[PDB]
Symmetry: C2
Amino acid sequence: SQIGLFSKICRVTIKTLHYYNKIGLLVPAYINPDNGYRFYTSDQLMKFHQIASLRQLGFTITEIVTLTQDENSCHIIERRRLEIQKQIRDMADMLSRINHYLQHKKKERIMLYQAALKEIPECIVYSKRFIVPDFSSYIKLIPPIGQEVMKANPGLTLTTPAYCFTLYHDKEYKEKNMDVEFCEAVNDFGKNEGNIIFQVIPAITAVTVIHKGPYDSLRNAYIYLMQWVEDNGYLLTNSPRESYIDGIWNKQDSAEWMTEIQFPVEKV
Amino acid sequence: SQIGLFSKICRVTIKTLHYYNKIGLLVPAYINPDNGYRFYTSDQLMKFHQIASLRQLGFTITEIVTLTQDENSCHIIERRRLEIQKQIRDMADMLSRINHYLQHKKKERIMLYQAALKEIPECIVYSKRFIVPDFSSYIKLIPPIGQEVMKANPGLTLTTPAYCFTLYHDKEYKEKNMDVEFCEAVNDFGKNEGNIIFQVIPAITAVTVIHKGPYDSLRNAYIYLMQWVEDNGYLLTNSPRESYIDGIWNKQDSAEWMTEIQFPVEKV
Ligand code: 118
Ligand code: 118
């Protein structure tokens, strides 16, 4: 039968048959060489049935071409079986995050905090860990650590980009008497002097939020993320990090300082 | 900051930044007039965080653009929540159906039937209802059924292609008796007489397989489909159909005949 009628019996378009004949799939029965027409037989219906059945299961064209001729090979099906489960879990997570987005946006008219997942690699740092009574004494006592360590460690170069952060080792969020550690990243090791130490922090996967403005409201950021981990069925696994990007060392308007809070979490 | 350092602050490729500048999504702070170099600032990172945050919910570039610059436009988010809720369902069928596939393939290491879902539009048919004692007698009795109808009507033109079939109105099969109907599709209505009548048959969505060979193995097809609609969670809403494509009237070898088995189903 000619191609315009075969396309109505099969209920598909003609461009589909042209494309199939081009790629080497469902080659016609008899092509007339003078005019160039294509004539199909009832033998082609029983292969198109198989093509449409395999395509309705999500397979791509090259696997179907490799399948109809290498019929012993059946592991492509499992290769697809793992990707389907991955797709179900990702769509089931995007759905929950969209619902959380709408639930959060219900009462608040606009939103400040926008969470995002990311990867953080391994690093070498020099660090110092101690207890502080408050945050203001902390802000003033950091820079002595920076002048002093360069005094005792000659020629120590930082990394690119710069990574300078602090760890809140306490299990519960507090306002005074905080156990805190300060870390800055360098390229190579050195030797310890007094309380200043050198160590290696492993690689993590973390959820991040960026806060912009004055320090006093940073707890608000810590509110949102503390909601986030509970709302979308996640579990906080390790101590949070607070890494400093823009502060008093580059600018004078303290209402333009920007920092980023990262909670290492896992989908369990 | 130059493009190569900013690409390491954000952990993204350079071609992505070029593309985002071309689209109009993320425009650099300052561009050199003669070189053409691109320089970025911290607020570019605050915005890239928002871009990635929006991109993690599955939106495409145009909606992300429309979301960032324009008004809130909440109707786009819930409208997405349907495209996910639907998609999961779609996904949730296929992981089932492929799981059907394996439970049959690994039983025989050969596949005789492959099922596929399709849609059959509405038609105008002539039809005759009756009870049959034995299928062979029905085959023998069909040529007179053709003869009465062929003589007494002017301008009785069949369809292109030819759709002639038999309707099985029984719920649970038995070899003793069968309430069947013979149907052949025509273009227009007219007057009815005798045991034959004209009627319209509405469109349906059916699962079909194609059987080639004699009829004395046809039950082996049904036992397959009676499983396929039961395991993978679909529901049989109406009487099956048996459509005849190629037989003694076009061919000579009965082992090269070809028929099509159709089960009308819905998603339940
Ligand atoms: C060791 C200890 C502190 C700093 Sb810094 C800083 C500098 C550049 C970029 C990011 C951070 C600092 C502040 C004032 C004067 C000199 C250095 C610093 C201080 C307090 C809180 C966060 C960072 C550096 C090394
Ligand atoms: C009225 C009733 C049945 C048939 Sb046919 C047939 C005709 C066209 C296309 C396909 C089938 C038939 C049988 C023998 C010789 C010539 C025509 C027919 C026979 C058995 C089963 C189904 C249809 C024809 C007219």
